[PDB]
Symmetry: D4
């Protein structure tokens, strides 16, 4: 390996696995408290899934749904509930690969920049999903 240096290098910021896990677990716990069955994903700004947790009894569609919501939230640094509303004036946003413009994903930032998204799916409504996503973010 050549070693790069130095004006050739840049840094990015991430949740640690420990922090992403804590947040994911908090979202599951919040759903469980309410008798809901959800899957939860935490996705890095660099578009990698860091944590997934499939709740007991969660619907089989919820796992990928949670992942895509998280990816979508971190991509636009916005809750997916709000992003869904953007489809009114830009309906083809939802044609972008890997996205899901449906309430339940919320971003997490560091220094004003998005670093992760937390996505939840499996509750009876996207708005409830997003409540639990926010509960996961809240522990950070």
């Amino acid at each position: 390996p050549v070693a790069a240096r130095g004006g050739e290098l840049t840094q990015s910021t991430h949740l640690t696995l420990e922090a992403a896990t804590k947040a994911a677990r908090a979202a599951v716990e919040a759903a469980e408290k309410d008798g809901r069955h959800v899957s939860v994903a935490v996705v890095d700004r660099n578009g990698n899934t860091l944590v997934t947790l499939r709740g007991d009894g969660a619907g089989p569609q919820s796992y990928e749904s949670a992942e895509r919501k998280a990816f979508t939230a971190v991509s636009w640094n916005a809750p997916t509930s709000e992003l869904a509303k953007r489809l009114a004036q830009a309906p083809t946003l939802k044609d972008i690969p890997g996205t899901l413009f449906l309430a339940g994903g919320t971003p997490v930032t560091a220094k004003g920049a998005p670093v992760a998204g937390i996505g939840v799916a499996g509750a009876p409504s996207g708005d409830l999903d997003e409540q639990y996503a926010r509960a996961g973010a809240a522990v950070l």
Copy 2:
């Protein structure tokens, strides 16, 4: 967005787009000097493609080949020529998704840790591909 802080955060190091582009271009130029027609990819340690360049006249198999070689080199922090030899004692390494254990990818490090791979494909041999990959890394 919740803002994370701070023991909850970690940093990683990357080539800038400028540096990845310079390296990719150098690999193409080295092949072109020799009358070779190659594709070149630079892939981050976080497994994202940063740059691709498809050489004039490069075979159609070369584009994905270059990408996979780069990914493989950065995953193991080793030239793919050497990694290919590991298949003698661990033949199922090559079953790992997204990999290509074939000469032509080389890693680039920062602070001793892998940060990118440069992959080249399209020359008459993997060893020549890897020569041009090293020529790209050499400018960093």
Copy 3:
């Protein structure tokens, strides 16, 4: 293998292959009685296909259509005819991977919880598809 125990374990409920097959066959028979040509799928709540049957003369689009309808019905524990109507107020539900919000899938429960979906496709209308799906469920 470590053996897990015991507060660490939970149970889920499923149709037996025998029951899923009986239901699938009944849906085909109901379509055949009417001179219709359908494919039928039974999909578990855990999102696995348990049975598929491709009717003689069924259109080539019907096989995957039936599978996706079944998956969709068991995911929301609701007939897909009704789920399709939810798209009026949540249009991006249909962006969830693996789903098909089109009449012809119906859920089957045990103890109040969804355990399988039966999906039918290939009839001249989704409503007819769903008639045959219900005929399959009816034998359980």
Copy 4:
């Protein structure tokens, strides 16, 4: 929904999300103690991923590698280190979709039957990966 009953129903056994998470976390912790950077997956016998955790600094190939190892271990109820050796007399086992016959996955049972696999990838050898997988299973 028709409600099924009763000779038409069967039960299966699973790790709870709580147990799968505890095991995954233990595998990560064991790797971290040794200064290793791994991804960990827990996959149910019904072939669904229940938990994934991407270690800080883990190679980008490790995430899918861990998932596939877990799936492979639970499919044959055997450590993937041993399964790899079966390729000597059945070399096309590795052509089965979704599999990875490479040390690092280990099964977990309940009542003598496989219920989950734990897969680890990212250490310098499959044998080390499998050490950490066993450390995760050990807490169950």
Copy 5:
């Protein structure tokens, strides 16, 4: 091999390769006469592509577009121009895998039953595409 017999067997009807080729070529020729650049596909009722022809200068999106139109036409035994209009009252028809509800595919029958679809893409409008598809069918 066991040999099946006989109440266990059924027959289906197909275009010969010779006939499918003649039709595809006629569609290309009709487009070429008009200075249009199209791709053409003939897809069997059993959902297999029998012939593809990529016109000189045809857009890169046209090849798969033609295939999907042909598949869609033979699946519903109707021109895709008409099928597109069905989306007004069944908008999720277009979520069925492998389909394209866009003018340019037309069915071919034998004994009243659909046996193939011919699909064309690459002209300035779907209606023109479908003109050339009909020109291909017309030689049968």
Copy 6:
């Protein structure tokens, strides 16, 4: 629709859904008699899956394995146990998409020509899988 006629048409022969189902069920029953847990697929010579049945307790890898074995057997009109042995002198046969050169698939013919393959997976050996596949074919 243009109607084709007549030197433009050819016929092919198939198992009826009824026959394919009978055979699949017989293979499952033979495995169940022995306390084995298998998936079974019947695939037409035209490469379409006609029937799948997932046995109670069958490993999650078995479903696709059974499908691919059936496809492979009907493609070469030979048991996959024998086809696997061909890899000695043509090792890249197994690189052909959709194939699985592993004991457990067996062909069924009509008029000397292959019309279907029956594939079984999930038993402790491919040879046992193929025993149950033959038991399914035997009822035809």
Copy 7:
């Protein structure tokens, strides 16, 4: 190899890698001047990606978005901002594989015929993306 000749041959025109790279780099530079973080792709009329550049800090959805926009622009020889408006009277255009009908892709021609598309994604609006795409084309 047989050598073809000569009425059997035709020529097509392309951007050189050098030109495609210059254009891609100009689009990135234009975004960077404005403090925007984008990915840029140049896609040939024959539907191959020639260059990709992932901007520092660009969202993870931007890379594929840029590629698809470029492909879409070169397929119809029109800016994707305008193509998006065509969805009003042909809504299923967007069902064509590989496309993205969202502002940010612009075509480049030679002799009146499209030879490449330049696509940009990652800015706060498609219209801004398309500004930077035009800035890349402008250097040619």
Copy 8:
């Protein structure tokens, strides 16, 4: 559209659709003369399929097999029978995406450079497949 000029442009050479079709048809005819049932593909050096023809009675694996052989032959400008032999000293060549290192593909050149590959599959041996591929090339 910006119009590019001129040191920014390069040309490539291709078979016309007419020539590719003539060659494909000749390969089918040669197989048919011998009572063989094959699929045939012609793939451009730029990696696009130009023509496919599925022979009456051809195995379902033959269609993709023919396509991949053609792609492989044009990528290395060599018959796939010879390329297969290269696997002895570079066994991971076959891990390159989209390839099939199995006799039956042959290249076609213009001005010494590869412009297309013709691939055939479905005969009882790769060597016979390649005979028919050569018969198709021979008419050019």
